[PDB]
Amino acid sequence: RIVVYGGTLQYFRVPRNSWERMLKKMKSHGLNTIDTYIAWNWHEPQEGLFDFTGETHPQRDLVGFLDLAQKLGFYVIIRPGPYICGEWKNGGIPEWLINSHPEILAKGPNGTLPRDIYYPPITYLHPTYLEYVMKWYENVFPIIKEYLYSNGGPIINVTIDDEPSYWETIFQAFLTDYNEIVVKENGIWHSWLKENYQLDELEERYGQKFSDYAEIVPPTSFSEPLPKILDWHHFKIWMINEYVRILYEKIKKYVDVPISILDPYLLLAAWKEFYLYVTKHKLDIHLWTEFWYSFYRTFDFKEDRLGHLYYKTGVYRYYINKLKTPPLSIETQTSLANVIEKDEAELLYALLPALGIHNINYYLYVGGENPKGYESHNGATWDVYSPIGLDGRERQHVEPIKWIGEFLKSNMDFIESQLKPKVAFGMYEPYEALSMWGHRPESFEESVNLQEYLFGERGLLTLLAMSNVPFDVIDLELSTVEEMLQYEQIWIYSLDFMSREVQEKLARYVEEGGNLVILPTLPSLDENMKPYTKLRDFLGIEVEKAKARDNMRLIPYISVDAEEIDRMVVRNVVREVKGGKAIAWVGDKVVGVMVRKGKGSAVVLGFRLQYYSSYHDLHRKFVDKILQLQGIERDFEVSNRDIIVIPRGNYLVVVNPRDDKVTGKVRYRGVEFNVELNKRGVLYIPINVEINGIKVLYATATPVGRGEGTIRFRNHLANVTEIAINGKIKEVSGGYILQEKSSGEKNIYVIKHESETFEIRV
Amino acid sequence: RIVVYGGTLQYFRVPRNSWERMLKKMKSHGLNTIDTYIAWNWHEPQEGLFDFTGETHPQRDLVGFLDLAQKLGFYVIIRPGPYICGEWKNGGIPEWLINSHPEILAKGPNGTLPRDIYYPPITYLHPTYLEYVMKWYENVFPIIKEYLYSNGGPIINVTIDDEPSYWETIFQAFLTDYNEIVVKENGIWHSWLKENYQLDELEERYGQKFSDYAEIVPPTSFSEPLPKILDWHHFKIWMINEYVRILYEKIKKYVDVPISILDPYLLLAAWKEFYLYVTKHKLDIHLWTEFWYSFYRTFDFKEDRLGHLYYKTGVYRYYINKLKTPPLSIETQTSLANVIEKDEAELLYALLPALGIHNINYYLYVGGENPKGYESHNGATWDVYSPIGLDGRERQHVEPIKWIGEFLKSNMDFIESQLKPKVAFGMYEPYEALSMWGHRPESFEESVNLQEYLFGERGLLTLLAMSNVPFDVIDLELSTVEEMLQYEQIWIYSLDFMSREVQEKLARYVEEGGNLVILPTLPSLDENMKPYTKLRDFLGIEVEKAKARDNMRLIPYISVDAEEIDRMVVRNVVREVKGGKAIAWVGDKVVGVMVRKGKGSAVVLGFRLQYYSSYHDLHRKFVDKILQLQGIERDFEVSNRDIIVIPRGNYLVVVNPRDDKVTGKVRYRGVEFNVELNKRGVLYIPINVEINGIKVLYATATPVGRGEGTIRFRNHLANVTEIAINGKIKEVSGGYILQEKSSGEKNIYVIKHESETFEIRV
Ligand SMILES: [Ca+2]
């Protein structure tokens, strides 16, 4: 079967006379799939004038492009919007539509938003907007239908809209949408309220009194009750889901290939709402994702990013496991950073398959130019360090792109490998919204700065990645106790509040034999912000009340001690913790404990544990201590803790996240070898695997080609590779045996290779 | 003629039995100077208990440390505080002092600040603080006196306190200092007011009627008049200046070596206040600076930083030219970043001498550890990727540190070269304070986000660096019209207000033949925020009133056209510009003009010109357009504009700011040659200079050592070097001549070298 290995070529931003050259160059890099949008405002340039054949402009020849992709043997992923984002005028929506029907434009709470803002926000469920989208889909889908793979054409998938986020306004609670149709009496907001709550529930949740749903005004400021603001958030998401459902139902009438969506809401925990909604409405949508890190500055992809990458790949693996559809990154950043240096690019691109994403599309692959009148974010240019530049040049990040494709296309044992960690991070969706907004309720003892404490450069999750602790992600609200019990250890970041349903389940998880780590407090309020203390009462742990600081100058530095740990630095307030056995103290004040209940355990830290790097390295040592205390053992040993190992059964992903030489021993599944990673990069090390007949116990290099009794290896990170096979190397090309010893059937070799590449023959 | 090339070894955080080994390793790196603090709270651990010999702890042996330094033939830079910052408890102030005289502590407008915050802020001028600082100086200066270079010891210089910034509070307008002594009736604030302003002056500037000076309460919030809040800032700066003068007067009684100070106020434009103050009080203080970029993440030093580096070096050059003191960077970042990759480190370290800073100390050179009770920002550890580690390992950033040192020591010609650019940026100190607070007055048409539009990743100043336009910085307020006229072109970033004096001098600069570039508006107010239009009226240019946006989502993207510039993207409001010759449009709307008045010209742009990278490259081309309009020619030519060239007379600093291969011709002072920069790095190319007898026309490598009839070259960015000389090469060590040709007595060689180093003999 086929690994999708793609590049984005947006035919409408590249000269038609260059399409075939650019596509042949894409094929020479090992790409088997083309991604492109079809832009509504490009193909309907005036109302009612549709051009898919280049009648009015050569780059309107969509049919011509699809014919050429077919002729050259590509699969096509087609993304017809209507919203395509794409740094493109109005994200693909016709200017003439916005100008003749400005009633469709989404409103702020003071009224009309400025008209000169990018991707003019539109009320998705305005019937005038949906009428125009239906006319677009009725014009473009007949073409897509003819070019489906099922009809002997290249199109293997259709994507819905583009990371639909209410036009990148969902990030602000009160920017949108106050259009008359959503807020008028008995409007969309009042109808949603009726569908989801009793009028008595809303009187309770808002602490007000209501005569009908029609007198509940949408919230307008952070001075309103948090549950009301979370309802407005989940309401805007439900309008996005209803829009997606309208598009899906229309697309289904035309196509029989799989239907996909990219990053709903441009959020992650909120995919809980996506999961529940497509389950309820029985929509067979493939969730796809994307990886962007640097905009309009140099690419910056170093160890700082690993918390975010492990969290996002974890949320994605959690959801496609439940939805049971194949993983795909439809946009893997290859543009819009000033330079993309190939070793930083490698650390991102090579970790996608390591973290479960073996179908990959690179965006933007082919640099181009924006036709006059369609500029938005870049003016005329559409070539910001694309792998293939406007003049046909090949830029440096083509190199990792080629090698990863050669590996994935030749190694079906890898795609069948699975990341199966003993450790999960327990995400709580309501926290996402508070963190996004930057909204800390006056009464909260904890900071909503999760970017700093949980996700970023010094985040806990970056700490776990750099501490050699790969982790899955589980939704606390969706997950059952049986699902939580698949994990030996679950880490949870707590703010003031946490639902009764979640705390009851967490309690049963530890009773049943689960191990919890909770920081930097325990919850004191339920989902309705009412006093509630289930975890406190169950664990028999009191946690001091103390107000986290927001003023950067007023955030303290505090030194924490533990067994064999002298003065580990932490930021912001540290809470006394009472109950169970002390495991961390600031002098005499106990600030972390461990408790046992039924078969399980909980560690509670009254501080925010973060990723700091130092000689002393206490942060990573403190992670080892929490694993040791709860009996959590890694499936691997490293003599150098700077070697990152992600186990995938018959492969080990070996990572040096720094441009700094790293050396040491790896032990895994009965075998031990030396690795030498002289710079930043990633290896895919086979373990106890048959490759083209040859039985490899281990190889300290990525197997990158197949032959009759031959293996081609790549080790760009050293000039020395160890291979162990049960069998004999009868010839080495591109290198020579420096060293070998037989042990019955086993032959353990050290090969010295002048370049990155060598072949053996058995 | 000795160049200071220094490392920081803080004896008090390194084991005493390690001092000699660490200093010998520093000697082996070519360092000739040692920097260290003397921490008051370390040597007076209780009130009256002084220990400089290690009676109570071996790391309190300051005396032994200076003996060892002297014995190993180092100079010493000594920094006895009393505030040393240093990520050290209270920044060096004793806990016993603060606990027994809490009245010295700085107050907020709401009263005392929390006691757990780092570097607890102190009223500098409180007599009880001063009495105890003087006792510290009375004990520590008799030792410093003994060890001065004038009395046969190693101490060359004494530094006052540490980048004194009111304890890192100056950055918040109303966090500090409301202590009784500064704010009581006829206290320090009322005294300052009287001394600086006639009372009626204060009433005109604030727009309130006052009876007496003691009615004027210090400002408390951003609702009060901007000119009063700027008075509060400059008053906080004056209290720091008084504190520096008291320290200096006391230091002068013991020492006859230069006295120095690091980054007053942790600001740059505010150095105007420091210059006026030491000129006024006739203090002979050496202004020293520092370069810090990345904290508690990986080191990030790529092209993005060059706006800031050029701006900060330029502010520094502007002021040491005026104070007539030698340049020095007393802290050049070598620590506190997770990894410092040697190419990114080199781009910073190699640009300091390029930009006029040829005396350099690296901080922190030797990793250590914090004794118990003296921890603050890092807990126990004081080894965060230092060049020399706690275990004596040498980390990768030692490599550029070694070669730069060898170059400075062996090329006296280089220090006597000058950077003398045709171009200057005009800084304006009132804009620094507004940008620092993030305070935009309600009435202001312009944004105060200078970090975005001016300084950072996409700053104007970054676009100038990357467009091959080196620039000086001049202060608009201190500079004469005669001094402005030393520049063929001045670039000015304008907000709503500009002083009537500066607007006068700018008009005279253009009348007398200067070339101004002003964006993104012309000023409309004077220093008192009163309507005033001298610049607009003089140029005969009207600029549209339009309100710049702050909400990220509401900030538009706009394409600008000019001749041979198709849709150059800009951000935020673009203003119509009336009067003068149109040179930039948005559609039909003129948004940029050139006028001529008297002998000179002004270009006025109604938009924020920023640094964006693309194939079409319009932002750099738009810089070339401006230089062409106003007759500004570079001193050099490059066939490939990605070769950054900083001319220094006899030397050409050649720069590749990316890890991307760069190839091209350079033409300078009538010679032409090819360079090959295969990764990120810097070469110091000699041009028509005599290097130990050898007449070098050019060499495409850094001359890193001389002998009799020999030059050792370093070229780590290629394996070929071009050398043109008046004589003949009789011997090549570490390479061979690939190609040669004569022209009269001149011989031109291509040398192939297998490593970065080779030697020629003539
Ligand atoms: Ca790099």
mmCIF file of N, CA, C and O in Angstrom, chain A residues 116 118-119 167 172 296-300 302 304 341 344 369-370 375 379-381 383 385 396 458 549 551 553 566-567 615-616 659-660 680, chain B residues 116 118-119 167 172 296-300 302 304 341 344 369-371 375 380-381 383 385 396 458 549 551 553 566-567 615-616 659-660 680:
data_model
loop_
_atom_site.group_PDB
_atom_site.id
_atom_site.type_symbol
_atom_site.label_atom_id
_atom_site.label_comp_id
_atom_site.label_asym_id
_atom_site.label_seq_id
_atom_site.Cartn_x
_atom_site.Cartn_y
_atom_site.Cartn_z
ATOM 1 N N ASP A 116 -11.109 46.816 6.279
ATOM 2 C CA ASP A 116 -9.741 46.676 5.707
ATOM 3 C C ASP A 116 -8.962 45.555 6.399
ATOM 4 O O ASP A 116 -7.775 45.360 6.040
ATOM 5 N N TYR A 118 -7.823 41.677 7.327
ATOM 6 C CA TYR A 118 -7.573 40.502 6.462
ATOM 7 C C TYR A 118 -8.654 39.475 6.777
ATOM 8 O O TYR A 118 -9.237 39.497 7.883
ATOM 9 N N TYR A 119 -8.927 38.623 5.784
ATOM 10 C CA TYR A 119 -9.995 37.583 5.785
ATOM 11 C C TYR A 119 -11.248 38.135 6.481
ATOM 12 O O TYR A 119 -11.661 37.686 7.558
ATOM 13 N N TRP A 167 -12.696 32.716 11.048
ATOM 14 C CA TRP A 167 -11.880 33.703 10.298
ATOM 15 C C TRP A 167 -10.844 34.288 11.252
ATOM 16 O O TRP A 167 -10.588 35.483 11.179
ATOM 17 N N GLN A 172 -10.322 35.460 20.305
ATOM 18 C CA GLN A 172 -10.794 36.591 21.149
ATOM 19 C C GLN A 172 -12.267 36.325 21.486
ATOM 20 O O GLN A 172 -13.098 36.195 20.588
ATOM 21 N N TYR A 296 7.825 34.878 9.255
ATOM 22 C CA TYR A 296 8.337 36.222 8.897
ATOM 23 C C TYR A 296 9.503 36.521 9.887
ATOM 24 O O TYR A 296 9.686 37.674 10.176
ATOM 25 N N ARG A 297 10.247 35.469 10.186
ATOM 26 C CA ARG A 297 11.574 35.498 10.804
ATOM 27 C C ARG A 297 12.277 34.222 10.411
ATOM 28 O O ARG A 297 11.666 33.347 9.721
ATOM 29 N N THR A 298 13.539 34.091 10.748
ATOM 30 C CA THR A 298 14.281 32.818 10.515
ATOM 31 C C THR A 298 13.562 31.646 11.176
ATOM 32 O O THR A 298 12.878 31.832 12.198
ATOM 33 N N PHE A 299 13.604 30.463 10.517
ATOM 34 C CA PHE A 299 13.075 29.226 11.114
ATOM 35 C C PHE A 299 13.835 29.021 12.445
ATOM 36 O O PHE A 299 15.079 29.144 12.461
ATOM 37 N N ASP A 300 13.085 28.699 13.494
ATOM 38 C CA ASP A 300 13.617 28.496 14.855
ATOM 39 C C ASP A 300 13.014 27.184 15.346
ATOM 40 O O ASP A 300 11.911 27.214 15.856
ATOM 41 N N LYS A 302 14.322 24.166 17.479
ATOM 42 C CA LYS A 302 15.329 23.557 18.351
ATOM 43 C C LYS A 302 14.580 22.859 19.486
ATOM 44 O O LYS A 302 13.363 22.856 19.416
ATOM 45 N N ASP A 304 13.440 23.703 22.243
ATOM 46 C CA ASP A 304 12.412 24.546 22.884
ATOM 47 C C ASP A 304 11.035 24.066 22.473
ATOM 48 O O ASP A 304 10.060 24.226 23.237
ATOM 49 N N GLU A 341 16.830 26.136 7.857
ATOM 50 C CA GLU A 341 18.130 25.448 7.835
ATOM 51 C C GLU A 341 17.871 23.952 7.970
ATOM 52 O O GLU A 341 17.036 23.546 8.768
ATOM 53 N N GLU A 344 17.506 21.923 11.516
ATOM 54 C CA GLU A 344 16.253 22.293 12.222
ATOM 55 C C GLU A 344 15.015 21.735 11.481
ATOM 56 O O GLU A 344 14.094 21.198 12.092
ATOM 57 N N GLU A 369 3.746 33.406 -7.103
ATOM 58 C CA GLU A 369 3.421 34.829 -7.271
ATOM 59 C C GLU A 369 1.906 34.976 -7.224
ATOM 60 O O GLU A 369 1.240 34.051 -7.628
ATOM 61 N N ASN A 370 1.400 36.061 -6.635
ATOM 62 C CA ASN A 370 -0.048 36.333 -6.535
ATOM 63 C C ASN A 370 -0.460 37.231 -7.694
ATOM 64 O O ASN A 370 0.087 38.319 -7.899
ATOM 65 N N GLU A 375 -3.602 39.698 -3.848
ATOM 66 C CA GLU A 375 -2.600 39.855 -2.730
ATOM 67 C C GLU A 375 -3.390 39.955 -1.433
ATOM 68 O O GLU A 375 -4.497 40.550 -1.377
ATOM 69 N N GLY A 379 1.896 40.704 -0.290
ATOM 70 C CA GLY A 379 1.935 41.527 -1.514
ATOM 71 C C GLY A 379 2.074 40.579 -2.690
ATOM 72 O O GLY A 379 1.491 39.492 -2.583
ATOM 73 N N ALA A 380 2.886 40.908 -3.687
ATOM 74 C CA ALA A 380 3.009 40.067 -4.909
ATOM 75 C C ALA A 380 3.620 38.708 -4.583
ATOM 76 O O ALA A 380 3.249 37.701 -5.255
ATOM 77 N N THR A 381 4.547 38.599 -3.599
ATOM 78 C CA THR A 381 5.358 37.366 -3.514
ATOM 79 C C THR A 381 4.565 36.199 -2.902
ATOM 80 O O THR A 381 3.715 36.380 -1.972
ATOM 81 N N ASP A 383 6.850 33.288 -2.793
ATOM 82 C CA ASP A 383 8.034 32.420 -2.621
ATOM 83 C C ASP A 383 8.856 32.953 -1.420
ATOM 84 O O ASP A 383 9.730 33.750 -1.651
ATOM 85 N N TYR A 385 11.063 31.095 0.830
ATOM 86 C CA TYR A 385 12.024 29.993 1.073
ATOM 87 C C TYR A 385 11.347 28.644 0.866
ATOM 88 O O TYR A 385 11.614 27.702 1.611
ATOM 89 N N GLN A 396 17.701 24.199 0.598
ATOM 90 C CA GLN A 396 18.474 23.216 1.377
ATOM 91 C C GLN A 396 17.571 22.200 2.045
ATOM 92 O O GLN A 396 18.028 21.078 2.220
ATOM 93 N N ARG A 458 10.094 26.511 28.319
ATOM 94 C CA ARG A 458 10.351 26.013 29.706
ATOM 95 C C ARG A 458 9.137 25.202 30.171
ATOM 96 O O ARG A 458 9.029 24.892 31.362
ATOM 97 N N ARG A 549 1.361 35.015 40.831
ATOM 98 C CA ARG A 549 1.690 36.398 40.412
ATOM 99 C C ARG A 549 1.615 36.436 38.880
ATOM 100 O O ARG A 549 1.996 35.460 38.277
ATOM 101 N N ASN A 551 2.569 39.830 37.386
ATOM 102 C CA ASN A 551 3.562 40.901 37.096
ATOM 103 C C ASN A 551 4.933 40.227 37.005
ATOM 104 O O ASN A 551 5.345 39.628 37.989
ATOM 105 N N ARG A 553 7.855 41.167 37.179
ATOM 106 C CA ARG A 553 8.900 41.636 38.149
ATOM 107 C C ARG A 553 8.660 41.023 39.542
ATOM 108 O O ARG A 553 9.629 40.859 40.327
ATOM 109 N N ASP A 566 19.570 19.301 45.441
ATOM 110 C CA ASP A 566 19.929 20.533 46.184
ATOM 111 C C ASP A 566 19.561 21.747 45.329
ATOM 112 O O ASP A 566 20.389 22.096 44.479
ATOM 113 N N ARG A 567 18.415 22.386 45.623
ATOM 114 C CA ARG A 567 18.021 23.760 45.182
ATOM 115 C C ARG A 567 17.759 23.756 43.674
ATOM 116 O O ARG A 567 18.525 24.403 42.909
ATOM 117 N N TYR A 615 24.362 22.249 33.967
ATOM 118 C CA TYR A 615 25.264 21.156 34.383
ATOM 119 C C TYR A 615 24.554 20.281 35.429
ATOM 120 O O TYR A 615 24.551 19.046 35.372
ATOM 121 N N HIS A 616 24.052 20.932 36.473
ATOM 122 C CA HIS A 616 23.440 20.264 37.637
ATOM 123 C C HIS A 616 22.202 19.467 37.236
ATOM 124 O O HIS A 616 21.993 18.365 37.814
ATOM 125 N N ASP A 659 22.759 21.109 17.951
ATOM 126 C CA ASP A 659 24.017 21.121 17.171
ATOM 127 C C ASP A 659 25.185 21.172 18.163
ATOM 128 O O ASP A 659 25.716 22.273 18.413
ATOM 129 N N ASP A 660 25.488 19.993 18.686
ATOM 130 C CA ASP A 660 26.477 19.700 19.760
ATOM 131 C C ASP A 660 26.646 18.182 19.736
ATOM 132 O O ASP A 660 25.614 17.488 19.833
ATOM 133 N N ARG A 680 22.810 18.041 14.936
ATOM 134 C CA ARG A 680 21.366 17.949 15.159
ATOM 135 C C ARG A 680 20.836 17.015 14.064
ATOM 136 O O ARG A 680 21.222 17.236 12.867
ATOM 137 N N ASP B 116 9.150 38.611 48.791
ATOM 138 C CA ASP B 116 9.734 37.372 48.206
ATOM 139 C C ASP B 116 10.284 37.680 46.802
ATOM 140 O O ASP B 116 10.948 36.824 46.217
ATOM 141 N N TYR B 118 12.625 38.983 43.681
ATOM 142 C CA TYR B 118 14.094 38.984 43.520
ATOM 143 C C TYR B 118 14.608 40.426 43.568
ATOM 144 O O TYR B 118 13.817 41.392 43.389
ATOM 145 N N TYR B 119 15.912 40.551 43.814
ATOM 146 C CA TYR B 119 16.620 41.848 44.025
ATOM 147 C C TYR B 119 15.677 42.840 44.705
ATOM 148 O O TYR B 119 15.263 43.835 44.113
ATOM 149 N N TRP B 167 16.764 48.576 40.331
ATOM 150 C CA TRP B 167 16.588 47.152 40.709
ATOM 151 C C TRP B 167 15.586 46.490 39.727
ATOM 152 O O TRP B 167 14.729 45.707 40.200
ATOM 153 N N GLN B 172 8.721 49.672 34.606
ATOM 154 C CA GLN B 172 7.305 49.980 34.928
ATOM 155 C C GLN B 172 7.228 51.392 35.490
ATOM 156 O O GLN B 172 7.935 51.669 36.461
ATOM 157 N N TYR B 296 17.298 31.091 29.067
ATOM 158 C CA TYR B 296 16.557 29.912 29.563
ATOM 159 C C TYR B 296 15.719 29.372 28.403
ATOM 160 O O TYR B 296 14.624 28.907 28.628
ATOM 161 N N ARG B 297 16.309 29.482 27.224
ATOM 162 C CA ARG B 297 15.941 28.723 26.011
ATOM 163 C C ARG B 297 17.246 28.508 25.248
ATOM 164 O O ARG B 297 18.264 28.967 25.681
ATOM 165 N N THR B 298 17.214 27.874 24.068
ATOM 166 C CA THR B 298 18.423 27.716 23.233
ATOM 167 C C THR B 298 18.828 29.119 22.750
ATOM 168 O O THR B 298 17.944 30.036 22.521
ATOM 169 N N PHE B 299 20.127 29.323 22.577
ATOM 170 C CA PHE B 299 20.641 30.575 21.974
ATOM 171 C C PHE B 299 20.027 30.716 20.557
ATOM 172 O O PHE B 299 20.130 29.765 19.794
ATOM 173 N N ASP B 300 19.476 31.870 20.263
ATOM 174 C CA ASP B 300 18.832 32.246 18.972
ATOM 175 C C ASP B 300 19.498 33.530 18.465
ATOM 176 O O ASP B 300 19.036 34.634 18.785
ATOM 177 N N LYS B 302 20.360 34.837 14.950
ATOM 178 C CA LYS B 302 20.330 34.797 13.486
ATOM 179 C C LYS B 302 20.105 36.209 12.926
ATOM 180 O O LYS B 302 20.189 37.206 13.686
ATOM 181 N N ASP B 304 17.769 38.003 12.396
ATOM 182 C CA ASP B 304 16.655 38.705 13.048
ATOM 183 C C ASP B 304 17.198 39.777 14.039
ATOM 184 O O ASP B 304 16.472 40.755 14.193
ATOM 185 N N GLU B 341 25.259 27.542 20.033
ATOM 186 C CA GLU B 341 25.913 26.956 18.857
ATOM 187 C C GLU B 341 26.940 27.944 18.280
ATOM 188 O O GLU B 341 26.699 29.219 18.208
ATOM 189 N N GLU B 344 26.270 30.673 15.513
ATOM 190 C CA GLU B 344 25.362 31.761 15.954
ATOM 191 C C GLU B 344 26.136 32.654 16.952
ATOM 192 O O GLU B 344 25.973 33.871 16.909
ATOM 193 N N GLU B 369 28.756 27.306 40.918
ATOM 194 C CA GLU B 369 27.683 26.794 41.788
ATOM 195 C C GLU B 369 27.453 27.826 42.879
ATOM 196 O O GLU B 369 28.442 28.507 43.237
ATOM 197 N N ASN B 370 26.214 27.935 43.367
ATOM 198 C CA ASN B 370 25.852 28.967 44.362
ATOM 199 C C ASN B 370 25.951 28.347 45.769
ATOM 200 O O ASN B 370 25.223 27.456 46.169
ATOM 201 N N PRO B 371 26.834 28.845 46.666
ATOM 202 C CA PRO B 371 26.802 28.362 48.042
ATOM 203 C C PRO B 371 25.411 28.536 48.669
ATOM 204 O O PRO B 371 24.663 29.418 48.233
ATOM 205 N N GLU B 375 21.629 31.541 46.688
ATOM 206 C CA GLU B 375 20.854 31.224 45.461
ATOM 207 C C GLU B 375 19.791 32.290 45.212
ATOM 208 O O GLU B 375 19.238 32.853 46.148
ATOM 209 N N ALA B 380 20.836 26.129 42.728
ATOM 210 C CA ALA B 380 22.228 25.728 43.062
ATOM 211 C C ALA B 380 23.183 26.030 41.900
ATOM 212 O O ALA B 380 24.343 26.412 42.140
ATOM 213 N N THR B 381 22.720 25.870 40.669
ATOM 214 C CA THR B 381 23.627 25.834 39.492
ATOM 215 C C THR B 381 24.020 27.238 39.065
ATOM 216 O O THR B 381 23.188 28.185 39.159
ATOM 217 N N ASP B 383 26.208 27.007 36.148
ATOM 218 C CA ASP B 383 26.818 26.522 34.891
ATOM 219 C C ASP B 383 25.702 26.247 33.885
ATOM 220 O O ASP B 383 25.206 25.085 33.842
ATOM 221 N N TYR B 385 25.724 26.388 30.266
ATOM 222 C CA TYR B 385 26.448 26.296 28.972
ATOM 223 C C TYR B 385 27.579 27.322 28.933
ATOM 224 O O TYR B 385 27.824 27.909 27.923
ATOM 225 N N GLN B 396 31.448 24.399 22.850
ATOM 226 C CA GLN B 396 31.734 24.662 21.420
ATOM 227 C C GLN B 396 32.021 26.149 21.177
ATOM 228 O O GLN B 396 32.813 26.422 20.254
ATOM 229 N N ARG B 458 11.471 42.025 12.259
ATOM 230 C CA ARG B 458 10.945 42.700 11.025
ATOM 231 C C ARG B 458 11.191 44.202 11.134
ATOM 232 O O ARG B 458 10.622 44.953 10.395
ATOM 233 N N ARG B 549 -3.565 50.630 14.286
ATOM 234 C CA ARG B 549 -4.281 49.610 15.090
ATOM 235 C C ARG B 549 -3.330 48.895 16.064
ATOM 236 O O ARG B 549 -2.122 48.768 15.753
ATOM 237 N N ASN B 551 -4.881 45.972 18.023
ATOM 238 C CA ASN B 551 -5.424 44.593 18.050
ATOM 239 C C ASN B 551 -4.803 43.801 16.873
ATOM 240 O O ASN B 551 -5.037 44.178 15.692
ATOM 241 N N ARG B 553 -5.406 41.273 15.297
ATOM 242 C CA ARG B 553 -6.319 40.682 14.236
ATOM 243 C C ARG B 553 -6.826 41.810 13.322
ATOM 244 O O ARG B 553 -7.271 41.528 12.173
ATOM 245 N N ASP B 566 6.323 46.087 -7.542
ATOM 246 C CA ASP B 566 4.946 45.548 -7.635
ATOM 247 C C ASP B 566 4.497 44.927 -6.293
ATOM 248 O O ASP B 566 4.867 43.756 -6.016
ATOM 249 N N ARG B 567 3.764 45.695 -5.465
ATOM 250 C CA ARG B 567 3.033 45.187 -4.278
ATOM 251 C C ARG B 567 4.030 44.681 -3.246
ATOM 252 O O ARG B 567 4.142 43.503 -2.963
ATOM 253 N N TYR B 615 11.707 35.789 -2.449
ATOM 254 C CA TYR B 615 12.384 35.790 -3.750
ATOM 255 C C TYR B 615 12.330 37.195 -4.409
ATOM 256 O O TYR B 615 13.345 37.658 -4.941
ATOM 257 N N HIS B 616 11.155 37.822 -4.429
ATOM 258 C CA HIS B 616 10.873 39.122 -5.078
ATOM 259 C C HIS B 616 11.636 40.225 -4.328
ATOM 260 O O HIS B 616 12.098 41.113 -5.001
ATOM 261 N N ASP B 659 22.945 30.014 7.716
ATOM 262 C CA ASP B 659 23.534 28.699 7.427
ATOM 263 C C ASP B 659 22.973 28.292 6.053
ATOM 264 O O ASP B 659 21.979 27.519 5.982
ATOM 265 N N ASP B 660 23.536 28.924 5.036
ATOM 266 C CA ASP B 660 23.136 28.747 3.620
ATOM 267 C C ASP B 660 24.308 29.214 2.774
ATOM 268 O O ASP B 660 24.830 30.282 3.088
ATOM 269 N N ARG B 680 27.096 29.985 8.097
ATOM 270 C CA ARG B 680 27.037 31.232 8.896
ATOM 271 C C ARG B 680 28.446 31.558 9.442
ATOM 272 O O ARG B 680 29.075 30.680 10.054
#
